[PDB]
């Protein structure tokens, strides 16, 4: 099997009116080829379970009952996507919601990639449609927009693959919360690709949340972009809790002065899984403040990978950027690779990065247990304390409890 050939085949599949944009990304995809473990950005992320596999794109259909059984409990404006396809019958109406929504394959407006890379090109080229979302000037929707993704694998050794593409434009003064939720229909492995680009205009405020909760055997490769103008505010929270191999990228450009940015993420790989969380940040204008908190909890035979690039352009005075990566290792076979990368070309700044690696504080666990709390609960209380700063940033208790439930379920002293 030749992955590039397979994907090329899916691109040419009979009955596919692919856009010029998609065609350009296909060429880039075939131009760059697949990286090896010798490539600067791929020393720790395995592609073996992908490079030599047969790929198919089977768009099935599910019932509201199946959707509900996997859906989050939340009052939102929910758009449902199944195996790479928007499913109207399973989605909520958007009229009067505060969100202008159109789903089609017209891509004339989409911005160029901040950081071009092989899997971003793959998704752009195989996405069957683009979700055009916009929030008009000064509008602050009452409910969060929820993009629910349901992907399924097929019987056999073939790997069903679906690629999702969404773009959000937050006009001046607009303030919205958008959530991307990914789940697997069943235990069959699948290859999920996703790309959510977002443009944040002046005085606009974004609350972005990503919940990748797919099964243990799937591959999840995504690349989101955040473009901020001046006086813009953007918060992005990612909880990568699923998949055999997951690689998420968030590339950002602060193209306006006086903006505030926060990008957080939690990686929780369990037995044999690899969770790769990466960010790319450009402080192109001065007077912006950026904060990043990426935490990982690795269980026996799991591997967390962090990569955080921060470039501060010359003239970007008064830049205030921080990045923190705290890693907690659960067993003697767990692994973690972290690579912060700072490129600072302005002196009048305050930039810093910090990363820690260690195991859960056993003295605290024993203390809790000596008062009567069982091992499982003591451990959960401490992990929750560890992730508290990330989960509380959700600013939504109801949602927070479901994310915590997902976290607690992946702990050794819980289910394993």
């Amino acid at each position: 099997s030749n992955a590039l050939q397979q994907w090329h085949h899916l691109f040419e599949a009979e009955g596919t009116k692919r856009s010029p944009q998609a065609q350009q990304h296909l060429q880039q995809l075939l131009r760059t080829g697949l990286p090896t473990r010798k490539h600067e950005n791929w020393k720790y992320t395995p592609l073996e379970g992908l490079i030599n596999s047969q790929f198919v794109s089977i768009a099935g259909e599910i019932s509201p009952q199946q959707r509900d059984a996997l859906a989050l409990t939340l009052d939102s404006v929910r758009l449902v996507f199944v195996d790479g396809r928007y499913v109207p019958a399973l989605s909520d109406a958007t009229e009067g919601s505060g969100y202008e929504v159109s789903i089609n394959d017209d891509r004339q407006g989409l911005p160029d990639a901040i950081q071009a890379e092989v899997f971003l090109h793959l998704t752009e080229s195989l996405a069957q449609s683009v979700t055009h979302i916009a929030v008009k000037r000064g509008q602050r929707p009452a409910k969060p927009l929820l993009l629910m993704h349901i992907t399924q694998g097929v019987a056999g050794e073939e790997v069903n693959t679906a690629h999702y593409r969404h773009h959000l434009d937050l006009a001046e003064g607009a303030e919205a919360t958008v959530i991307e939720h990914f789940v697997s229909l069943n235990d069959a492995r699948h290859f999920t690709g996703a790309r959510f680009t977002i443009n944040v205009a002046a005085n606009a405020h974004l609350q972005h949340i990503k919940l990748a909760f797919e099964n243990p055997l799937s591959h999840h490769f995504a690349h989101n972009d955040l473009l901020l103008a001046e006086d813009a505010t953007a918060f992005s929270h990612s909880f990568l809790l699923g998949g055999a191999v997951l690689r998420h990228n968030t590339s950002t450009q602060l193209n306006g002065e006086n903006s505030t940015l926060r990008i957080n993420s939690l990686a929780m790989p369990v037995k044999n899984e690899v969770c790769d969380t990466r960010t790319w940040l450009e402080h192109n204008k001065g007077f912006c403040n950026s904060r990043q908190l990426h935490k990982t909890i690795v269980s026996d035979k799991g591997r967390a990978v962090f990569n955080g690039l921060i470039n501060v352009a010359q003239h970007a005075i008064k830049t205030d950027g921080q990045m923190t990566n705290n890693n907690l290792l659960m067993g003697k076979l767990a692994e973690v690779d972290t690579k912060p990368q700072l490129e600072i070309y302005a002196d009048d700044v305050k930039c810093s990065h910090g990363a820690t690696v260690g195991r859960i504080d056993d003295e605290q666990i024993f203390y809790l247990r000596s008062r009567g709390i069982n091992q499982q609960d003591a451990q959960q209380m401490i992990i929750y304390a560890f992730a508290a700063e990330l989960t509380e940033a959700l600013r939504d208790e109801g949602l927070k409890q479901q994310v915590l439930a997902r976290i607690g379920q992946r702990l050794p002293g819980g289910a394993r």
């Binding site: 003295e363 605290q364 024993f366 203390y367 809790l368 247990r369 000596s370 008062r371 009567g372 709390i373 069982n374 091992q375 609960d377 003591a378 209380m381 401490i382 929750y384 304390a385 560890f386 508290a388």
Partner: protein, 247 residues
């Protein structure tokens, strides 16, 4: 209620306790003393359930059950509580959430019900006062920002709230002066109901002036080689032991 017989314990292959025997009945206060290196910490660690302490011989029975087979939380359920020499800080976990969770746990074990939210608070207030604790205890993180003296007092508050049967003070008098010692004493003494028992593993003797023991025991190379009542403390002064005094 507690019976320790011919207990042998080693740490990292070094024999620490070499045949320690002790008998504690309901309503008794026992003081264990001696020089450093003779077993104080290993005894406490073994009873509490620290996993790096290898019991190579002997027995420890509590309420007619083998204590050594119980996990730390079950020993607490059974009724054993230990005031740490170094109380642990639990950042991100409020004393309220901690105590509430602990109380429910031991109440569940033991087959009873826990207090009712607001009642739990009427209990706290009473204890925060009994031990001169910060009125904003419930919301702060367990022992974070506390001095050594405050951490010791917090542990006693825990003791009074979780209501154990056998209370062990593992050199928790260390670093405390007459004032703190007196407050700690008022906390422990308030727990004397004629049924609960206490084991005071002394760092120094002064604590025994406020929490008078019924029994006093002296350790020597991991064994108790002398027992008596409170008057024994004065007798030991005549031996000129260097460990007997100076905190």
């Amino acid at each position: 209620m507690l019976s320790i017989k011919d207990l042998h314990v080693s740490v990292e292959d070094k024999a620490i306790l070499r045949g320690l025997s002790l008998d504690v009945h309901p309503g008794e206060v026992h003081a264990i003393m001696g020089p450093n290196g003779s077993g104080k910490s290993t005894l406490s660690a073994t009873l509490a359930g620290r996993e790096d302490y290898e019991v190579t011989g002997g027995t420890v029975e509590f309420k007619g059950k083998d204590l050594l087979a119980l996990s730390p939380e079950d020993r607490a359920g059974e009724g054993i509580f230990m005031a740490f020499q170094y109380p642990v800080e639990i950042p991100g976990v409020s004393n309220q959430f901690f105590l509430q969770t602990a109380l429910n746990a031991v109440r569940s074990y033991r087959g009873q019900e826990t207090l009712d939210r607001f009642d739990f608070q009427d209990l706290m207030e009473e204890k925060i006062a009994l031990l001169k604790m910060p009125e904003d205890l419930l919301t702060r993180s367990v022992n974070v920002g506390f001095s050594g003296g405050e951490k010791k007092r917090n542990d006693i508050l825990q003791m009074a709230v979780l209501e154990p049967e056998l209370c062990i003070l593992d050199e928790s008098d260390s670093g405390l002066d007459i004032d703190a010692l007196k407050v700690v004493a008022d906390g422990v003494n308030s727990l004397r109901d004629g049924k609960r028992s206490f084991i005071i593993v002394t760092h120094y003797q002064r604590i025994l002036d406020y929490i008078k023991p019924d029994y006093v025991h002296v350790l020597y190379q991991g064994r108790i080689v002398k027992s008596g009542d409170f008057t024994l403390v004065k007798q030991l002064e005549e031996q000129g032991y260097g460990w007997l005094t100076e905190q």
